UniProtKB/Swiss-Prot annotation, chain A:
Organism listed in the record: Escherichia coli (strain K12)
Location (main, coarse): cytoplasm
Protein name: Nus factor SuhB
The record's free-text note on cofactor binding: Partial activity is seen with Co(2+), Ni(2+), Mn(2+), Zn(2+) and Fe(2+); in the presence of Mg(2+) these cations inhibit.
Up-regulation conditions: Transcription is autoregulated. Repressed by the Nus factor complex (NusA, NusB, NusE (rpsJ), NusG and SuhB).
Binding site for substrate: 68, 87-90, 184, 213
Note: E.coli makes very low amounts of myo-inositol-containing phospholipids, so the catalytic necessity for this enzyme is low.
Oligomeric form and interacting partners: Monomer. A monomer-dimer equilibrium. Homodimer. The rRNA transcription and antitermination complex (rrnTAC) consists of RNA polymerase (RNAP), NusA, NusB, NusE (rpsJ), NusG, SubB, ribosomal protein S4, DNA and precursor rRNA; S4 is more flexible than other subunits. Binds to RNAP, which decreases IMPase activity against 1D-myo-inositol 1-phosphate. Association with rRNA gene-transcribing RNAP is dependent on NusB. Interacts with AR2 domain of NusA; crystallizes as a 2:1 SuhB:NusA heterotrimer.
Catalysed conversion reaction: a myo-inositol phosphate + H2O = myo-inositol + phosphate; 1D-myo-inositol 1-phosphate + H2O = myo-inositol + phosphate; 1D-myo-inositol 3-phosphate + H2O = myo-inositol + phosphate
Record note on disruption phenotype: Conditionally lethal, cells are unable to grow at 30 degrees Celsius and less, grow poorly at 37 degrees Celsius, but do grow at 42 degrees Celsius.
Function: Part of the processive rRNA transcription and antitermination complex (rrnTAC). The complex forms an RNA-chaperone ring around the RNA exit tunnel of RNA polymerase (RNAP). It supports rapid transcription and antitermination of rRNA operons, cotranscriptional rRNA folding, and annealing of distal rRNA regions to allow correct ribosome biogenesis. This subunit may play a central role in organizing the structure. Has D,L-inositol-1-monophosphatase and beta-glycerophosphatase activity, has less to no activity against a number of other substrates. 2.5-fold more active on 1D-inositol-1-monophosphate than L-inositol-1-monophosphate (1D-myo-inositol 3-phosphate). Specific activity increases significantly upon heating. Only beta-glycerophosphate and adenosine 2'-monophosphate are alternative substrates.
Cofactor: Mg(2+)
Positions of Mg(2+) binding: 68, 85, 87
Family: Belongs to the inositol monophosphatase superfamily.
Length: 267, 331, 98, 255
DNA sequence: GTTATCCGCTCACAATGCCACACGCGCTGCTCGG
RNA sequence: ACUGCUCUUUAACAAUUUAUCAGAUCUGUGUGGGUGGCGUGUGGC
């Protein structure tokens, strides 16, 4: 069989991805509409968001939904939350760079229950449900087999919206570059997390992430054999936007490596 | 090739397509369904519009660039109906229905036309070609719009024309419809300067004598009274004053020659630089460099082909440009 | 088998509604299915609005037709041809079984 | 200039087909060297069908010379092998047709996304039927820089880091894919504005520099000269971002 | 009273290796099931 | 008996912005592939 909420979510994600892909071939219609410090929100984001919300309301007119745009639309049954990013890495889309994904996760009683991310360009569908695992178009996902820092590929995002910590981040970057093999910088935390679940990157870390972006990936990597944490092993990440994740041994090595360079602001 | 480009699929979902070939005999796959070949569109209108299939509004032609744009022309046999109100339908939703079904594949329901000229003209769905020059030996015609809408006529990536050429089969040409179009046929009568500068006082008298070309006025002006007797308006004092004005005209041709050799831009910022004589200025602008920044906008590979410019000379010259521009980061 | 294979059909188009209804009742009367009446309940007003890039700061009410046809004989070939023989889009085909 | 590019894209398509068809098999650097050698083999053997006399320069065995030394063919059937090692679907074949020391034709082909960028002097840079334009930027605000780390030459890293630091205080964001040729192709289609790299090698970026130049852009070495052909410290893009980046990156020169 | 001291009591924890052979290892009124 | 007298010759358009001269594979059926765990007891050395 299959998990029901997962199924309705993947239907929503399919529709949204098809809409985004269809609009991707007319860059004269989607404009750059900035919201904060280089966080564009184009009209296509609004359209995809509305499509997803409509598709959901058919099957759950009572579930409270969360969205970076519409804040928090309450529902008559607010024990279960629907966190959405209709588009991740808006910048990668405006530059028409074909690497982005829509992310839909459903939390139950606070604990994340199901998650999906969908890249329409490569047509890849990372699904994950707790107690059953993670799948990539039908293949199980056990993350990277790395157990050190050598030969390891580290995906990351830069605090290009919280540039005050830049130095700090860059500091640690240098430290990391003394032990790892190579970096990756794609521009969509959801897809980076997904890659962590697929072992295509030996780990990942980031500073300054909104609570509505990792919610679709943290469960992905969790049911993908990997683990997440704050920059110190705690769990305040859900509030600090500071994530470090990967297969367990690599996470341990990274934490022991980063704990010193860390500026005590994030602690 | 048979799939749409961006039509994402997933094992478990149903899709629609047209069975374009069956192979019960071949040693492998025996059923061949496509979704790109144009007849699909045709048959899909069959399954959509209750007119087509009832043989009242038959689909004549349909050209298609997948997932991007599909032009379609249909004729009607009963004058009771027309495509815009029934084949487009109410509020244009049936074509919208098939569009959404084929993944936002925009469609151009163009009213078929049987006059090959007007046929290829209408098949240009968003356009207005107010100047047609029809020819069949080459299939090409001046099919273009007023200056400014040329993008709106060719459409993105040539679609709005690449389809019509695919649809009409007649090769197409899109240059202009108001400017630059008489140049194809009304080119010897469109030189507004001299003819009207002589006509402003002739508007009381008459037009000018077209039965001789007189474009090459020099020789054909040395014709006897015959030409001057046959036609009126070009009086003898008129011909003599106009010969003085044609002295002004040949001097004007020489002066235009002089002016056409003015955009080379030898400036101090472009002349005194190391290894730069005035002839280096003339050479660098002989490729089209009318400023100093442009010199700093090319590499040795691209500033090549110059008649007497090696790789090290142009190298140090690019270096000088990038010093005066990008190394000191100044102007 | 069970009786109430009752298909309601909303739409805003008319002639294709007629085409689909005729084809459906054809399958019914051809597959042995004892068709009931199409019985088009009174055409209803249905509110639209321009939910696109609007005019700078266009049907808004339409006569949606309703064909409420019923089939009470579900042979094997009935469901066979039904799921086989297709219908145009732009029609609401919420059916009932019971 | 047609038939050269014809053979180029023919070999490119066959190589990409081979690479993808192979990539559909599972695993968990033997395999990548195997497929690299096999792709080079199919490439060169399809080449010798026409002009088996041009001098091929691979990335492995130096310069496989030939009897008609007027044309060199720079080849890389795989760039950023790390990708194909770790299943990340981002890698492209890079073919470059150079003559008399300079390059005339270039073709980069991503099999996975089935992208194919051709480029040649004058006739421009096409993406399967597109007159490319590069980006439209004129500054370093709201811009993207396709970066690159020395995963073999970490000594520069420190000053490199400094660059990054200063760059981060100027630009908007960064990218990193590992396939320098793909970075170049992306700056050609304006998918990312500026590109730079510390110590690359001609076999990879040979086609990409021709791409970015043909798309209305320009290349440079770190110190504005042209020793990149031997130093591979590339900085490329449309002149606007190239100035906006060089002005702030040259003051930390170490090569 | 404090403060530690030591002591009676309690509880955990060990029991040769092999072999060979033999024997045996849910139930029971709830659940279901037609 | 005792709410019920013409309203006046059929669906009523979505398509849209460089630009072009259109720009080899259709094979197999060679083949590996079609009762034990524990406990107890006995005896032996
Ligand atoms: Mg988002
Ligand atoms: Mg290589």
């Amino acid at each position: 069989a299959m998990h029901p909420m997962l199924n309705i979510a993947v239907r929503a994600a399919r529709k949204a991805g098809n809409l985004i892909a269809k609009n991707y071939e007319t860059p004269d219609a989607v404009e750059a509409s900035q919201k904060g410090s280089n966080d564009f929100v184009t009209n296509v984001d609004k359209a995809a968001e509305a499509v997803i919300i409509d598709t959901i309301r058919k099957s759950y007119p009572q579930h409270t939904i969360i969205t970076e745009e519409s804040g928090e639309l309450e529902g008559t049954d607010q024990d279960v939350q629907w966190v959405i990013d209709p588009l991740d890495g808006t910048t990668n889309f405006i530059k028409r760079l074909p690497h982005f994904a829509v992310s839909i996760a459903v939390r139950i009683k606070g604990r994340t229950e199901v998650a999906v991310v969908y890249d329409p360009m490569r047509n890849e569908l990372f699904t994950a449900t707790r107690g059953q695992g993670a799948q990539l178009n039908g293949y199980r996902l056990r993350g990277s087999t790395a157990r050190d820092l050598d030969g390891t590929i580290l995906a990351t995002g830069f605090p290009f919206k919280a540039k005050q910590y830049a130095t700090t981040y860059i500091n640690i970057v240098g430290k990391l570059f003394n032990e790892c093999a190579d970096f990756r910088r794609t521009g969509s935390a959801a897809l980076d997390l997904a890659y962590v679940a697929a072992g295509r990157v030996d780990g990942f870390f980031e500073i300054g992430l909104r609570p509505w972006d990792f919610a679709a990936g943290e469960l992905l990597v969790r049911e993908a054999g990997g683990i997440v944490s704050d920059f110190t092993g705690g769990h305040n990440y859900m509030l600090t936007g500071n994530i470090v994740a990967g297969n367990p041994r690599v996470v341990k090595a990274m934490l022991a490596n980063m704990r010193d360079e860390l500026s005590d602001a994030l602690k | 090739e048979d799939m749409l480009p961006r039509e994402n699929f997933r094992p478990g979902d149903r899709v629609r397509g047209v069975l374009y070939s069956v192979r019960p005999e071949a040693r492998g796959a025996q059923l061949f369904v496509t979704r790109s070949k144009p007849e699909m569109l045709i048959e899909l209108f069959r399954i959509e519009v209750p007119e087509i299939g009832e043989e009242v509004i038959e689909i004549k032609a349909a050209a298609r660039d997948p997932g991007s744009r599909a032009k379609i022309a249909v004729k009607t046999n009963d004058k009771r109906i027309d495509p815009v109100g029934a084949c487009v339908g109410m509020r244009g939703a049936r074509v919208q229905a098939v569009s959404t079904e084929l993944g936002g594949e925009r469609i151009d329901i163009v009213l078929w036309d049987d006059n090959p000229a007007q046929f290829v003209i209408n098949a240009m769905a968003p356009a207005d070609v107010a100047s047609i020059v029809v020819d069949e030996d080459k299939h090409t015609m001046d099919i273009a719009v007023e200056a400014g809408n040329l993008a709106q006529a060719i459409g993105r990536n040539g679609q709005n024309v690449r389809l019509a050429s695919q649809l009409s089969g007649w090769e197409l040409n899109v240059m202009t419809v108001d400017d630059l179009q008489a140049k194809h046929q009304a080119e010897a009568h469109a030189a507004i300067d001299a003819f009207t500068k002589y006509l402003d006082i002739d508007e009381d008298f008459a037009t000018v004598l077209v039965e001789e070309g007189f474009s090459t006025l020099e020789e054909l002006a040395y014709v006897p009274m015959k030409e001057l007797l046959e036609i009126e308006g070009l009086d003898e004092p008129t011909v003599e004053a106009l010969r003085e004005r044609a002295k002004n005209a040949l001097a004007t041709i020489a002066q235009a020659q002089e002016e056409s050799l003015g955009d080379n831009k030898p400036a101090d910022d472009l002349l005194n630089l190391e290894g730069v004589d005035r002839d280096l200025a003339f050479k660098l602008a002989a490729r089209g460099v009318c400023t100093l920044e442009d010199l700093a906008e090319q590499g040795i590979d691209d500033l090549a082909d110059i008649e007497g410019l090696t790789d090290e000379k142009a190298g140090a010259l690019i270096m000088a440009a990038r010093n005066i521009c990008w190394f000191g980061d100044e102007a | 088998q069970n009786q109430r294979i009752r298909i309601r059909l909303k739409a805003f188009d008319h002639r294709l509604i007629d085409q689909a209804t005729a084809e459906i009742v054809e399958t019914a009367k051809r597959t042995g299915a004892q068709v009931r009446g199409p019985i088009p309940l009174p055409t209803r007003k249905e509110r639209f609005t321009v939910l696109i890039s609007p005019h700078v700061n266009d049907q808004y009410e339409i006569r949606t037709h309703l064909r409420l046809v019923d089939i009470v004989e579900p042979t094997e070939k009935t469901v066979d041809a039904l799921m086989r023989l297709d219908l145009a889009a732009g029609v609401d085909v919420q059916i009932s079984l019971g």
